[PDB]
A paper describes a structure:
Here, we present a strategy for the de novo design of a simplified scaffold of an endo-α-N-acetylgalactosaminidase active site, a glycoside hydrolase from the GH101 enzyme family. Using a combination of trRosetta hallucination, iterative cycles of deep-learning-based structure prediction, and ProteinMPNN sequence design, we designed proteins with 290 amino acids incorporating the active site while reducing the molecular weight by over 100 kDa compared to the initial endo-α-N-acetylgalactosaminidase. Despite lacking detectable enzymatic activity, the experimentally determined crystal structures of a representative design closely matched the design with a root-mean-square deviation of 1.0 Å, with most catalytically important side chains within 2.0 Å.
dEngBF4 crystallized in two different space groups, P212121 (form 1) and P61 (form 2), and the crystal structures of the protein were determined using the molecular replacement method described in Materials and Methods. Form 1 has two protein molecules, 1A and 1B, in the asymmetric unit, whereas for form 2 one protein molecule is present in the asymmetric unit, resulting in three separate structures. All three structures aligned with an RMSD of 1.0 Å or less, revealing a common (β/α)8-barrel organization with an overall fold similar to the hallucinated model. The movement of this loop, however, is constrained due to the formation of a disulfide bond between Cys124 and Cys163 residues, potentially contributing to the observed high thermostability in dEngBF4. While ProteinMPNN proved to be highly effective in improving the pLDDT confidence score, certain loop regions remained unrecoverable, which correlated with regions displaying poor or no electron density in the crystal structure. Enzymatic assays of the dEngBF proteins with Galβ(1–3)GalNAcα1-para-nitrophenol as a substrate showed no measurable para-nitrophenol release during the designated incubation period (data not shown).
Residue numbers in the entry: 3 to 50, 58 to 59, 61 to 99, 116 to 209, 220 to 263, 267 to 286
Write the structure that this text describes.
């Protein structure tokens, strides 16, 4: 069967350097689908008594986040939610302070996951956490990894990982994975053992980036462009898929 194609798209709140309101994000997503027809869309999103007005620009409110997802979900786009606040604020410093491993496994991570699916019921496909990131914080044991994967698979979520440190246990757990290769290594043996589970995000440098990927297994490839400014920059290479075919 032919392979799948997606346009990995980053969305953030209006701030000092860019961003767009839920109306602007909705219009851009409609303009991408208007050009790219049979191409999937992967929208990345960062997390923002609980607001209505954003406490400081550069972050969305929970309503604006829901308004974007509900519009992107209606377009058929998959949502990948970034739970970076798992290291946010020992405190009163804005650092990436790491709570004890128990405090995170026992309480916060299930807490954040419950809050997650409470705000976006069944409308999130992948979730990103800065824990499997080559270890960094905490050295995860054998059962510790598969416990976090169980919390994610419980709520029907996939995972986005930057490091392929634990990829050889994620696929055994049968959970969909999103490998961000937009600047480790991986053998094509995985694509014949787990074809419908891996989706590789690549930095678009040319058609040679796709051909090098399609030469292996990669039946699910997401394209992330370098560069609301990017509306037209993506509308340049959006014709790079009508003629690409390659199926």
């Amino acid at each position: 069967e032919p392979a799948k194609i997606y346009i990995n798209l980053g969305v953030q709140a209006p701030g000092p350097f860019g961003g767009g309101t839920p109306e602007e994000v909705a219009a851009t997503l409609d303009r991408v689908k208007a050009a790219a027809p049979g191409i999937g869309i992967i929208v990345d999103l960062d997390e923002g008594d609980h607001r209505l007005y954003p406490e400081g620009a550069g972050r969305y409110t929970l309503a604006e986040e829901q308004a974007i997802v509900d519009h992107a979900k209606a377009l058929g786009a998959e949502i990948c939610y970034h739970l970076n606040l798992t290291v946010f604020l020992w405190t009163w410093t804005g650092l990436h302070h790491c709570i004890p491993k128990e405090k995170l496994l026992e309480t916060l991570l299930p807490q954040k996951l419950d809050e997650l699916e409470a705000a976006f019921p069944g409308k999130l496909d992948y979730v990103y956490l800065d824990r499997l990131f080559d270890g960094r914080c905490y050295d995860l044991t054998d059962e510790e990894v598969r416990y976090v994967l169980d919390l994610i698979k419980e709520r029907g979520l996939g995972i986005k990982i930057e490091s392929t440190k634990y990829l050889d246990t994620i696929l055994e757990s049968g959970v969909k994975v999103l490998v961000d290769e937009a600047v480790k290594v991986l053998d094509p043996k995985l694509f014949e053992k787990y074809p419908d589970l891996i989706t590789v995000e690549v930095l678009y440098e040319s058609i040679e980036t796709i051909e090098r990927a399609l030469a292996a297994g990669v039946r699910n490839i997401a394209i992330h462009f370098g560069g609301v400014s990017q509306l037209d920059e993506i509308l340049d290479g959006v014709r790079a898929i009508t003629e690409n075919i390659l199926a």
